[PDB]
Amino acid sequence: KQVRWCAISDLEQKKCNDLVGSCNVPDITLVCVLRSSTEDCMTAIKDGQADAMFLDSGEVYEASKDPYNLKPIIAEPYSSNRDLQKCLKERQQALAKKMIGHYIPQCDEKGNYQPQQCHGSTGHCWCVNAMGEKISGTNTPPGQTRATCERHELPKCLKERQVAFVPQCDEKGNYEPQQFHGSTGYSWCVNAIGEEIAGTKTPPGKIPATCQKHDLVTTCHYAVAMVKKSSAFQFNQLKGKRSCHSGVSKTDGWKALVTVLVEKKLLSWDGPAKESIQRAMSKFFSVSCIPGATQTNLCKQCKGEEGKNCKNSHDEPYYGNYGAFRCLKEDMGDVAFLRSTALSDEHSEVYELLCPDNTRKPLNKYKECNLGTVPAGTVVTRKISDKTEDINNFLMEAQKRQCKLFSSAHGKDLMFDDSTLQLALLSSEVDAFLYLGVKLFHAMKALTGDAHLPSKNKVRWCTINKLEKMKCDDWSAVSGGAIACTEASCPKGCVKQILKGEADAVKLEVQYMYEALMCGLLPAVEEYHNKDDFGPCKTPGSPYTDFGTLRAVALVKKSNKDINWNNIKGKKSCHTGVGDIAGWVIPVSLIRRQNDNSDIDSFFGESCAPGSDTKSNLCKLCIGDPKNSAANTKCSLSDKEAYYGNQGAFRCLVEKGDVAFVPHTVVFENTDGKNPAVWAKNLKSEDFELLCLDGSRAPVSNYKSCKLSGIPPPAIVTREESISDVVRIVANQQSLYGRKGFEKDMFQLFSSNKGNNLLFNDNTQCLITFDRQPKDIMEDYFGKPYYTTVYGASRSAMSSELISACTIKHCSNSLEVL
Ligand SMILES: NC1=N[C@@]23[C@@H](N1)[C@H](COC(=O)NCCCCCCNC(=O)c1ccc(C(=O)O)c(-c4c5ccc(=O)cc-5oc5cc(O)ccc45)c1)N=C(N)N2CCC3(O)O
Numbered sequence: 037k038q039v040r041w042c043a044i045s046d047l048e049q050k051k052c053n054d055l056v057g058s059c060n061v062p063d064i065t066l067v068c069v070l071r072s073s074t075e076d077c078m079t080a081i082k083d084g085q086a087d088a089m090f091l092d093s094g095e096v097y098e099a100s101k102d103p104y105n106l107k108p109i110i111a112e113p114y115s116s117n118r119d120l121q122k123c124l125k126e127r128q129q130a131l132a133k134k135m136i137g138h139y140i141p142q143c144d145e146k147g148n149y150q151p152q153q154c155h156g157s158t159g160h161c162w163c164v165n166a167m168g169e170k171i172s173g174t175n176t177p178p179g180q181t182r183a184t185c186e187r188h189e190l191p192k193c194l195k196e197r198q199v200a201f202v203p204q205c206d207e208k209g210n211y212e213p214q215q216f217h218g219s220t221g222y223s224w225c226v227n228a229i230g231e232e233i234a235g236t237k238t239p240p241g242k243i244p245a246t247c248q249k250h251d252l253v254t255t256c257h258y259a260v261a262m263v264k265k266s267s268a269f270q271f272n273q274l275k276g277k278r279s280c281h282s283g284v285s286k287t288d289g290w291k292a293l294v295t296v297l298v299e300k301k302l303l304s305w306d307g308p309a310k311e312s313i314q315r316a317m318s319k320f321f322s323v324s325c326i327p328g329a330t331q332t333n334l335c336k337q338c339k340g341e342e343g344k345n346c347k348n349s350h351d352e353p354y355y356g357n358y359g360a361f362r363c364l365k366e367d368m369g370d371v372a373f374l375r376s377t378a379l380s381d382e383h384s385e386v387y388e389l390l391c392p393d394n395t396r397k398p399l400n401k402y403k404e405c406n407l408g409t410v411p412a413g414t415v416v417t418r419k420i421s422d423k424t425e426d427i428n429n430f431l432m433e434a435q436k437r438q439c440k441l442f443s444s445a446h447g448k449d450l451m452f453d454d455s456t457l458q459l460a461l462l463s464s465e466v467d468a469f470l471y472l473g474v475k476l477f478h479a480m481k482a483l484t485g486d487a488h489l490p491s492k493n494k495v496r497w498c499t500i501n502k503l504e505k506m507k508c509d510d511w512s513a514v515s516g517g518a519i520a521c522t523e524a525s526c527p528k529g530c531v532k533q534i535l536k537g538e539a540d541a542v543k544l545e546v547q548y549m550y551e552a553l554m555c556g557l558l559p560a561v562e563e564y565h566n567k568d569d570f571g572p573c574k575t576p577g578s579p580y581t582d583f584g585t586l587r588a589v590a591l592v593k594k595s596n597k598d599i600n601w602n603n604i605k606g607k608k609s610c611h612t613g614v615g616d617i618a619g620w621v622i623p624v625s626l627i628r629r630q631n632d633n634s635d636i637d638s639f640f641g642e643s644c645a646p647g648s649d650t651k652s653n654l655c656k657l658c659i660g661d662p663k664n665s666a667a668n669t670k671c672s673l674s675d676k677e678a679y680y681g682n683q684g685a686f687r688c689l690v691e692k693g694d695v696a697f698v699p700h701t702v703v704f705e706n707t708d709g710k711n712p713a714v715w716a717k718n719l720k721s722e723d724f725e726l727l728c729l730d731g732s733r734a735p736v737s738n739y740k741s742c743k744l745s746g747i748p749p750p751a752i753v754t755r756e757e758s759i760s761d762v763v764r765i766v767a768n769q770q771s772l773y774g775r776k777g778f779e780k781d782m783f784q785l786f787s788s789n790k791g792n793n794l795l796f797n798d799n800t801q802c803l804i805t806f807d808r809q810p811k812d813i814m815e816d817y818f819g820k821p822y823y824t825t826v827y828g829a830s831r832s833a834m835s836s837e838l839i840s841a842c843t844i845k846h847c848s849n850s851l852e853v854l
Pocket residue numbers: 562580581582583740741746748749806807808809815816817818819820821822
């Protein structure tokens with residue numbers, strides 16, 4: 037009902053009051069809370085005095101910690117080579133605007149961009165590629181011969197696959213990060229456009245380099261140092277010069293400059309714990325104006341009146357990018373540190389750029405003459421996110437109603453960056469770490485002084501609940517300084533903690549490994565489940581035969597001799613539940629491979645898969661809880677469904693089903709003599725068979741050959757630099773706390789009075805070290821069957837916020853490179 041925006045200056049207050057007066061959003065009233073600086077506004081948000089503000093990207097990290105605890109919620113989206121169905125989305129966005137006579141993009145029936153795009157209000161037309169980028173020069177006004185538009189959509193990867201080393205592309209035609217040459221055994225990493233990254237080519241038999249994912253994005257901004265052409269100094273002569281800065285906490289005014297200076301060995305500085313950055317900067321420059329600074333000389337060149345001087349606020353006339361430009365223009369500094377948004381061609385006669393290679397270049401060369409790329413600022417609120425919905429609704433309705441959000445007659449860059457075109461809602465999972473990305477988050481953490489000093493003799497294990505926390509505390513009290521404990525809420529949280537340097541290693545099931553392998557984490561050890569061969573556990577190096585890995589199989593009855601793999605369409609099937617690997621991952625992936633229609637909702641007849649749509653075919657004949665008529669527990673992803681789990685799917689097969697997609701074990705767990713006493717009392721394993729991929733049948737004991745696929749073992753993973761430091765300690769803690777260890781009467785690693793299946797699965801025999809083979813990490817872990825079946829041997833099969841945070845953003849002037 038109400039949204040309070042915090043303004044840091046008088047001009048922002050005027051713009052916010054103008055928006056309150058002019059922008060009319062139904063059921064939401066805007067309120068303008070005035071503060072004197074950016075930090076005061078962050079504090080007012082922390083105290084519940086305000087609701088949301090806009091922060092520079094560099095200010096995000098310090099915003100996620102005491103005494104602020106804020107999180108980014110609303111950010112400007114960028115265009116990339118990963119945007120699928122961009123035309124339909126942009127047309128829907130344009131049609132949602134309460135305005136007449138604007139450009140609504142035109143798509144075809146399939147949903148792609150029509151090669152010719154016209155602006156109906158003006159009559160102008162132009163040509164456009166697959167991503168909607170205007171072909172240069174094709175803009176024609178009405179009454180003039182139109183430019184004939186061609187069809188430019190064939191990506192570079194598929195075009196290089198033709199006329200042919202054969203590159204590997206994904207399902208969308210993008211370059212896979214890892215390229216493997218078939219003629220000569222070589223592996224390397226490539227750019228988002230296919231350019232080979234240096235230092236990644238590896239001969240055969242050698243472990244390939246881990247390739248990182250790349251996304252090609254456009255409309256990037258940079259941190260630049262502007263100077264006047266009348267001056268003559270270069271970059272390595274900034275010592276003792278007068279400097280103008282946009283702000284002490286902004287990337288384009290401080291952080292990028294600090295990074296470049298410390299890498300070029302120009303700034304005499306010890307460390308964040310030994311000396312503050314501001315002291316080294318005060319000793320570096322002579323007199324400067326750096327808004328928000330705490331050293332007097334770094335505030336001498338500012339023009340703010342008494343009580344307004346050197347504040348992170350437009351009350352200081354030298355604050356911001358345009359403030360730093362005015363600082364340079366009025367001859368109070370020799371170099372301004374700002375963002376490429378403040379550049380213009382009207383300044384290309386008096387001003388130029390100061391590049392870190394000790395040369396000067398004109399402004400238009402800012403892509404080759406900068407201090408680094410600057411990510412877009414974001415609208416942040418309290419981490420508890422008690423107002424995110426109202427703020428989002430207000431901003432979205434203000435954008436749809438064409439309110440003056442990103443411009444003002446009172447000034448520039450007020451409330452938001454003027455360069456902003458559109459604000460979108462971020463996923464609730466996005467914190468400062470997910471917003472900045474792994475590398476940039478670690479850079480901010482090291483710059484602020486929170487960089488963890490790694491210890492090569494202590495492993496920080498990450499837990500997912502209080503029971504695992506208790507077991508880990510036992511292990512830490514009994515380990516003698518070798519094991520410490522961190523707490524998280526889920527395995528993905530532990531992966532995030534490891535990527536942030538807050539933890540060291542954690543155990544993950546297979547369904548969590550993909551993202552973990554996408555972010556550069558390597559499997560340190562793996563659980564061994566062979567309960568009949570202790571050989572590999574008693575002495576390392578013993579060649580293991582079976583790792584105890586489960587094998588997904590399609591179990592049928594000997595009675596029905598008409599169910600083969602090539603006629604499972606329309607048959608009644610049973611699943612353990614939506615999400616399970618052997619129950620609803622291997623079979624659905626296989627079916628989606630062979631049947632190009634790709635519709636499991638209509639593939640089977642009346643299948644029973646707990647967790648699907650209660651009205652769909654995947655939820656029929658599921659008897660949910662026999663003696664509970666006061667509730668409707670059909671298709672429940674819990675034990676309230678009698679056909680849930682391995683035993684539940686086996687009962688579904690026994691009672692009403694034809695085939696069950698289950699691990700190979702349940703057949704022996706509910707037949708023979710080892711069986712329950714309800715529906716499997718006189719059942720035998722010799723009355724069932726397994727369906728093989730070639731369309732034949734096999735006995736149940738033939739699961740090592742007649743199987744759908746194999747499941748990789750749960751992997752205990754860590755970072756690369758910690759690999760050699762983890763495994764050792766594991767061994768050191770296994771021979772003491774394993775199943776046949778020296779101190780197994782003090783703590784058993786694979787059992788606990790605190791709970792079942794804590795830290796590791798309680799049926800684990802031991803932890804075998806990962807033998808790194810010279811092939812792809814994804815392949816080496818999953819197995820080429822599993823890889824090619826589930827993820828199609830592609831790094832683009834899944835997309836999440838964590839994967840985006842582990843992706844390099846390759847800037848480019850356009851996506852026209854195809
Ligand atoms: N670094 C590393 N990696 C392994 C390994 N150590 C351990 C697991 O080792 C064990 O536990 N012992 C069992 C194997 C010991 C060797 C016995 C001879 N077997 C193979 O050499 C073999 C290995 C992997 C695969 C695979 O599936 O890719 C296949 C295999 C095929 C290869 C090409 C092809 O067209 C078809 C294939 O078809 C299959 C069909 C099947 O039906 C069943 C298996 C295959 C064959 N843990 C991991 N997480 N790893 C990750 C990947 C990995 O497996 O290499």
